[PDB]
Amino acid sequence: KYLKSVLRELVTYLLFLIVLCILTYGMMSSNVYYYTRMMSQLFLDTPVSKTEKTNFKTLSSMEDFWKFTEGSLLDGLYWKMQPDNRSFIFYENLLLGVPRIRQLRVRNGSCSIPQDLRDEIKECYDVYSVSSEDRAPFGPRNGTAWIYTSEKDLNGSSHWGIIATYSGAGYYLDLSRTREETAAQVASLKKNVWLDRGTRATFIDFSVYNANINLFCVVRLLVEFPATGGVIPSWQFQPLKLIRYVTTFDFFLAACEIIFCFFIFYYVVEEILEIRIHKLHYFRSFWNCLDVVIVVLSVVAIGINIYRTSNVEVLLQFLEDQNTFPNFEHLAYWQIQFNNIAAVTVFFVWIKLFKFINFNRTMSQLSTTMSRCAKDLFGFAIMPFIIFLAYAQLAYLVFGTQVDDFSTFQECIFTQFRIILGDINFAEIEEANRVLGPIYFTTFVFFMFFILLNMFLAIINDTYSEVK
Amino acid sequence: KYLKSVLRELVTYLLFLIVLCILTYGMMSSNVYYYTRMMSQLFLDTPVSKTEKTNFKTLSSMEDFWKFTEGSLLDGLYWKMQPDNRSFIFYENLLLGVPRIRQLRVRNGSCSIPQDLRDEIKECYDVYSVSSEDRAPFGPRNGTAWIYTSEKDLNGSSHWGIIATYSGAGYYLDLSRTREETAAQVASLKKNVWLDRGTRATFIDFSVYNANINLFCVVRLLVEFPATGGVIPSWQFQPLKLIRYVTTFDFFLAACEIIFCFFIFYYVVEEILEIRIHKLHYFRSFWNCLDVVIVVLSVVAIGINIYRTSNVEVLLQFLEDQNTFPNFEHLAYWQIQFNNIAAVTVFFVWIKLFKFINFNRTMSQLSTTMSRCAKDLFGFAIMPFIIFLAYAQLAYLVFGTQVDDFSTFQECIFTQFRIILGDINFAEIEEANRVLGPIYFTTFVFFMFFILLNMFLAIINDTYSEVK
Amino acid sequence: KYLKSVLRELVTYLLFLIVLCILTYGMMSSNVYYYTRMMSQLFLDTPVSKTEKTNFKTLSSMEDFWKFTEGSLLDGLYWKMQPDNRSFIFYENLLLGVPRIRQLRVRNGSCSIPQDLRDEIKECYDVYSVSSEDRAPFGPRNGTAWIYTSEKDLNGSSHWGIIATYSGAGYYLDLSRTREETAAQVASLKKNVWLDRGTRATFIDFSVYNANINLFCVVRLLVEFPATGGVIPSWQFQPLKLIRYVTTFDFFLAACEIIFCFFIFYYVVEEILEIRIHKLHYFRSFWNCLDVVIVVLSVVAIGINIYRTSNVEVLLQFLEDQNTFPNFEHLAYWQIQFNNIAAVTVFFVWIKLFKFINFNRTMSQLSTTMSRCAKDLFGFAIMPFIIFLAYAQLAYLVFGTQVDDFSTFQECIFTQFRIILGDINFAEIEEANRVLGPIYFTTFVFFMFFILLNMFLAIINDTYSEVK
Amino acid sequence: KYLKSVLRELVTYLLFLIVLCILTYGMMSSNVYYYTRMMSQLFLDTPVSKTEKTNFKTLSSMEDFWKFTEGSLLDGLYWKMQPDNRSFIFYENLLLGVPRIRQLRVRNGSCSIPQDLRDEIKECYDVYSVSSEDRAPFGPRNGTAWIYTSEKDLNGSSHWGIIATYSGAGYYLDLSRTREETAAQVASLKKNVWLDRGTRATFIDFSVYNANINLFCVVRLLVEFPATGGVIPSWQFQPLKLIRYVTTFDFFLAACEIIFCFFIFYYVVEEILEIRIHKLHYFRSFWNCLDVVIVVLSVVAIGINIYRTSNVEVLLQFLEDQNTFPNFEHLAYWQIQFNNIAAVTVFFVWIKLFKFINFNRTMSQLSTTMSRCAKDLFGFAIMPFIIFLAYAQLAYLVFGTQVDDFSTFQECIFTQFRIILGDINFAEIEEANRVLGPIYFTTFVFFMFFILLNMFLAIINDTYSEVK
Ligand SMILES: C[C@H]1CC(C)(C)N(C(=O)CN2C(=O)c3ccccc3C2=O)c2ccccc21
Ligand SMILES: C[C@H]1CC(C)(C)N(C(=O)CN2C(=O)c3ccccc3C2=O)c2ccccc21
Ligand SMILES: *[C@@H]1O[C@H](CO)[C@@H](O)[C@H](O)[C@H]1NC(C)=O
Ligand SMILES: *[C@@H]1O[C@H](CO)[C@@H](O)[C@H](O)[C@H]1NC(C)=O
Ligand SMILES: *[C@@H]1O[C@H](CO)[C@@H](O)[C@H](O)[C@H]1NC(C)=O
Ligand SMILES: *[C@@H]1O[C@H](CO)[C@@H](O)[C@H](O)[C@H]1NC(C)=O
Ligand SMILES: *[C@@H]1O[C@H](CO)[C@@H](O)[C@H](O)[C@H]1NC(C)=O
Ligand SMILES: *[C@@H]1O[C@H](CO)[C@@H](O)[C@H](O)[C@H]1NC(C)=O
Ligand SMILES: *[C@@H]1O[C@H](CO)[C@@H](O)[C@H](O)[C@H]1NC(C)=O
Numbered sequence A, B, C, D: 001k002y003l004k005s006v007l008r009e010l011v012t013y014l015l016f017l018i019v020l021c022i023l024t025y026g027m028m029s030s031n032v033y034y035y036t037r038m039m040s041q042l043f044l045d046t047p048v049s050k051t052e053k054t055n056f057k058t059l060s061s062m063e064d065f066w067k068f069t070e071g072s073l074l075d076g077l078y079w080k081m082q083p084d085n086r087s088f089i090f091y092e093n094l095l096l097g098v099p100r101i102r103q104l105r106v107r108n109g110s111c112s113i114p115q116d117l118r119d120e121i122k123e124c125y126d127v128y129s130v131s132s133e134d135r136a137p138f139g140p141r142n143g144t145a146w147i148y149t150s151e152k153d154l155n156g157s158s159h160w161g162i163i164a165t166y167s168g169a170g171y172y173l174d175l176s177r178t179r180e181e182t183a184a185q186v187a188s189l190k191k192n193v194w195l196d197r198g199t200r201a202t203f204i205d206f207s208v209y210n211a212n213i214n215l216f217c218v219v220r221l222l223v224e225f226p227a228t229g230g231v232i233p234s235w236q237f238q239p240l241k242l243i244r245y246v247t248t249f250d251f252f253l254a255a256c257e258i259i260f261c262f263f264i265f266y267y268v269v270e271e272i273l274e275i276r277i278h279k280l281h282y283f284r285s286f287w288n289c290l291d292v293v294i295v296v297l298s299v300v301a302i303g304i305n306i307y308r309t310s311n312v313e314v315l316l317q318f319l320e321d322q323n324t325f326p327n328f329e330h331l332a333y334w335q336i337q338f339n340n341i342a343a344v345t346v347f348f349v350w351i352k353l354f355k356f357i358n359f360n361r362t363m364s365q366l367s368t369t370m371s372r373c374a375k376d377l378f379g380f381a382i383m384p385f386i387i388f389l390a391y392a393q394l395a396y397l398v399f400g401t402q403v404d405d406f407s408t409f410q411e412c413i414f415t416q417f418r419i420i421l422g423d424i425n426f427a428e429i430e431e432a433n434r435v436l437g438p439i440y441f442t443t444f445v446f447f448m449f450f451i452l453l454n455m456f457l458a459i460i461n462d463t464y465s466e467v468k
């Protein structure tokens, strides 16, 4: 053995854990934050031009976007000379191919215009949706910047923005490899109005490859034009590692991946034989409730890890033609998904360690604890949970039209979590509503602690009496 | 059944709750925050002109106000051309009618000037009050900007400002529909001094209507001139929705309103029949103490909801003449009142859900919990409540002449709530008073926790000992 | 009772309390914060000139001080014309008399210069002290700006600065009533070097009087020149009220003062007759320990209230000659002292209210507690009190040369109070020391909570066990 | 003894403590923070030149570094004239000798370049390491700025930077004593490219000596060039005190040092005679464990102190030749080490005071206090400790490529300590990941408090049952 059985289970668990830790350490590159930070500082913090003070992070109108797209954008994207024409950003980043700019727009006449306001206003442009999307050519046709291209022909996928979710098709244009031609193309796009009252979003896409450390970086700047006015920017910088098997460390990581696959295969084959007939109530004590989930997530990882590594050359064929736009959005998306899945799996694997330290003599210390709150901490918490949601609803209804922290109801939830801890922005809350604001704040911060003390006293009293 | 009776009460309560939730979701428009945020950024954050850095949010003198009123105000209010003379703000907002500027001022000679300073100073202008208000013409009469107009003729109401509450009458002027004429009028107002040492407040009012989503926005910029000097700005943007019954969703909301009225009528008739003779002590257990309040607030809502929907066309008759100033202050005020009332009602309805969950075996968990502490938390808390107010009084007397967070005594209360949580501005507190400041801070944060621990220990001791 | 005796004591206490509350409300003027805020914004936030961005609050060198003293200082102090020569600040503040500028400096040759660095360094100027103070004339004598004047002839007193405490004598100059002559005088002072390597402090003093609300404001700007280099500014704006008995409210306040004096005389005579022979152990139960202190502080107030109101005309004689510098420093100092004393007295009077509420059935709720935690909280807290001071000493020794929050050891104490609550500036702490910083932070925040939990658990265990 | 023995132990402990406190007060100079603050403000906050807004603290490119090194650096380092050529910074700091600039760089061709990207990329420059370091001359040789000099010939040591640890050798150049020649040298270095794609770090070193208070200040500005691009600055200002025995206070401190040596000798001899044969289990009670750490730290501190006080003149021989670069890095390093050691020793000495207070009737309060939790708080805390590290691992894996607070895994630990207290930067966390961010935040802040409350309930119940 019994002790021998638990000891062999322990040792195989530590081998699994150390393999997973090695994999995570290897996959996590060192000092990769500074790469993205330099990219973001270059493309987001420099003023759009010498005179005015606004940058991409603080954009307010369409003219600001036009100034940015021919000002700081071209200056930070095409670097003159190293001492050919390759545009090594920061002298060592090698802008790949050409950037691409894309526009999404809707149709005129998409309201039910009020009859009273019919002789003054003549046209509408509703908020973005697939039903309101425009598909007709406009302006001087003369190319692909004025002709709709479907999401299948326009080789790409959708994207989830702040205001809505965008299709991934529309009117696009591929810029050139040098500064002068891109400047001319942007000037032509500005002369013949390309953004006029129907535009709902604009994407800018490009990618660079640092050679000193082999890492690609995918940049997707997005500017959203609401139906009300103004702009809303977003950047989403993301590094990638496509070319692998360069040093012995890479082969070591590949071997670690193979042995991890063997480990999880052994776990799943051993777990399934333990649920066959014996222990039909196997899903209890919650420890089992974890150990299946692990392998589940594990196999999902393999899926992604197989679906994204075997489809790089079919997309890295850009190497044969360095004069087009390389699509790297899918690789970045799947890299992000794999990162999230791996982080969740390692977190759960780490917390599964308690299964073994319990075998000693921590039953009372732990056992008792986890058993003395199943219907106590989770039984008295219904009242605070209801009051929390009621206060969130009240805050969302009162505020949320004046305060950014109280729009988008779910965010209100988070805001309350930051009010209890001490992250408060009371100035704007009080400014928005001079009567209900302070009342809400004081009543919330008082009632939360009052009911928490009631909970604690009730647990103490009740428990004591029960064990008296 | 008895169980059947509580079950039918439960089901009717959930129907009422779902109807109320549908009403609140429908009345709360989506992404309406960005409309106000764009408006405020355009009219508050842009510098008053190209050279100096000050904006409306940071105004300091009368000359700054004069620069703003002919600089960033006109630039962000009259937009040149879309590719007529209609000034579509952000190309899609349609400034309605003309803006209006109004001034409130007091009379010379309103002190009891000290006899010693009688040959040194000659004139006074007291703080604003209805008793000190001026009503005589001044300067070149030549119109309504130099002649007092009563609050009845000047079609409007009062307003509650930071310093005082203002009447709503005074000297007003209606600007024009184009940039040149308004610029000329403002230049004429500046030449023949319109603001001179007697002015106490200045209002700027206008409204826009977005057609893509039918919403009005009412803007009322206010600048207060204290008797001491300087200016104090206030903006108070507010979106409004007048034209309804546009899509089927609006008719669905109307049906929801009707059925909600029926629901609350049923509730009130049931309450009044249950309060007739039996249970003359009906106002106990506190649950009843809530269920009447609900219907009370409910009927109040209807009042507002009826008093503001039937008085739109008598005020929207602006549609027949698009060359005057449309008064929308009353509609915005009543919309705000309705929003507050509805939020409070839904909060109370949500917290009334506990009445049913206690019928299960949870009733023994809120005995001690919601009972017991009736005279324990509410009995031991008199000492902390007194100490809190004593510290607030001390802080208001010591500080409050140097620190903005400690003026206006009630605000001191709120400041203390932010000191316990962790929102502290210790730099200015210590700078204002280098001896009493730190002493107050440390003694407050120590004594609060000390007395809280004493409360908790005393409650534990009494509970245990009492039931020992 | 007996009940009749406690009832008459209660009613006389509430009469005393309401009299004190009326006095405090009357003495606390309304919206007096905005006066000081406008003054400080005008004299501290405006840039020293159009081109440079630095202001008085952020000064770094002597040239910056020279730019300020002939730039924003003169611009915000002499206002051209209202539509004579009176300089109404903000058109309504009436600069009184003339401003005065004063300098304090030390003697050359006040080191014990190291023998090694004797051929490279020739002169010293030690830190400021009365022993190192200079008293000899320098430069072109030609007036009082280059001749030392004693603290008795130079009619004034000392001042407590950030670096040291300054005497109040030195080299002074009285400016003029108009802009041109003061500009000429400052230019002459700058030409013939007035600040050169020996200057240790510089004071600028003036005062204004608002006529709409009778209030004086005393301004004393101070710039300190350390022995190391640079400057350190301080402002100390203070509103003052000299001319009283203007409206009936003032006479009401005078009557309230008289009746308060009668009240405290009655209290002190009752206290002294209650201590004659009976109750030689009178100083117990701590309630008596309060009620004498009250009257003590009370009489002190009268002293100040009599020492500052009877010496106004002997100093307001400025009214007969409006061409000199009016000394108002003493009046402001005594006003501040009176404010502090009054605030402390009202705080103690307010907390003395518990003496009556305990006579009811509440005596069993705090009798127990105030005979219990007496040696439990005040006996178990010696360990946290020692650990707190040890950590403060460690932080002061490690930091304090790089971080402003950890110099001046007492301030370290306050910083720790802000770390527990959540006011943290971890960036600079970690930057100053990359190894000891985080170690100190984590160990402090862990050990504090650990020992607090041990304290509370020990009290619980001890209590229960004791009364088992 | 017995009481006599503990009393003599007490009195000798207080003599030791007062001697140590005197030493710490003496070694800690007063108002030495302002010296470093002025230096840092002068050399870090001034813009690199008049037009652009960037300073040393915010540098982004190589051109910014070149602008700084001939702009604000020369302006704040060579001061024109006092009313010779000595460059008294702030007129009273006496720049010592000449500054020195040093560069570290790597070799071309240090990748394993992918075969696919072989016709597009030609050269590499790996991250800095001793293996990749370059040692060949480059450019026009013509001096020592283009020729490698070993760490032994280049008289200096290593340094621990943000990105890596640097050797201390490389290509250096000694500037001149006047502004014109240094400007010419920097212009020549900029013309013939000195920083080109291989540079990995750059050091600037100089030192000043204030004569009014005898203190040296050592400045070492460092700029790191990552393999990705951009720059990362660091300053590390440090005041130093070399010339001692100037006043009687210095001799008093020397006598204190000698007597403190005598105290530790007496303590160590007593401890060694108390461990000879009797009490072979001597290492218990935590006092017998603390008092040996005390003496170990003390002897280490004195070893360091006597190692650095006798190693000054062989390095201060700069006095004979004021035309070279004085090396003060070692003295500053050992001063920092001594300060850290002394602070730790005094902290431990202060906390050792508890040994005596428990001899009174307080020992019954320290029993439960310091034991009833030996296996109770340290036994129930394994679960929170594991969950904390699991959450840190999850945060480091998810974030850390987008957020500066979540890179460098150990820092994540500290970040969590600041989230519980209330120091939160939720905006960037939510922006980096819009799904996992809020989930991580809410789950962490909920589970931490849940587990803490569970611990407290479990320990209370357990203790109660045990002593039932
Ligand atoms: C500027 C100022 C102007 C104004 C009159 C619209 N405003 C309110 O009116 C708020 N407000 C209530 O809720 C309220 C409730 C019961 C009686 C009186 C009032 C009352 O007067 C308000 C509300 C929030 C922030 C500023 C303001
Ligand atoms: C920039 C960097 C440079 C430098 C080498 C002086 N620096 C330290 O050296 C700190 N430091 C210790 O305490 C320490 C303690 C035991 C072994 C090694 C070290 C060790 O290396 C330090 C200390 C605080 C902030 C930055 C720095
Ligand atoms: C298409 O026509 C527009 C407007 O005449 C012109 O600006 C553009 O250059 C044309 N493009 C081509 C490819 O001819
Ligand atoms: C989509 O993929 C095909 C496959 O080769 C490619 O030829 C085409 O150019 C892509 N579409 C683009 C890049 O718009
Ligand atoms: C009224 O008189 C003033 C001053 O003479 C002048 O500026 C203004 O234009 C006049 N207004 C009218 C309507 O005549
Ligand atoms: C007040 O209301 C009446 C009602 O029609 C209107 O005629 C009048 O113009 C209003 N007053 C104004 C707009 O000043
Ligand atoms: C004193 O002499 C200085 C220098 O010669 C001169 O600037 C100043 O004006 C003189 N003052 C008087 C009062 O003559
Ligand atoms: C000090 O007080 C006396 C008393 O009248 C006055 O004459 C003298 O001018 C004062 N000293 C000054 C203002 O420097
Ligand atoms: C070395 O040569 C370079 C380039 O010709 C020149 O700039 C530099 O001044 C020369 N140095 C010396 C010491 O001759």
Ligand SMILES: *[C@@H]1O[C@H](CO)[C@@H](O)[C@H](O)[C@H]1NC(C)=O
Pocket (backbone or CB within 6 Å): D153, D154, D155, D325
């Ligand atoms: C290193 O020390 C020696 C010892 O005198 C000295 O001569 C030499 O100049 C130093 N190296 C430098 C300063 O680069």
Ligand SMILES: [Ca+2]
Pocket (backbone or CB within 6 Å): A420, A421, A422, B420, B421, B422, C420, C421, C422, D420, D421, D422
């Ligand atoms: Ca907090």
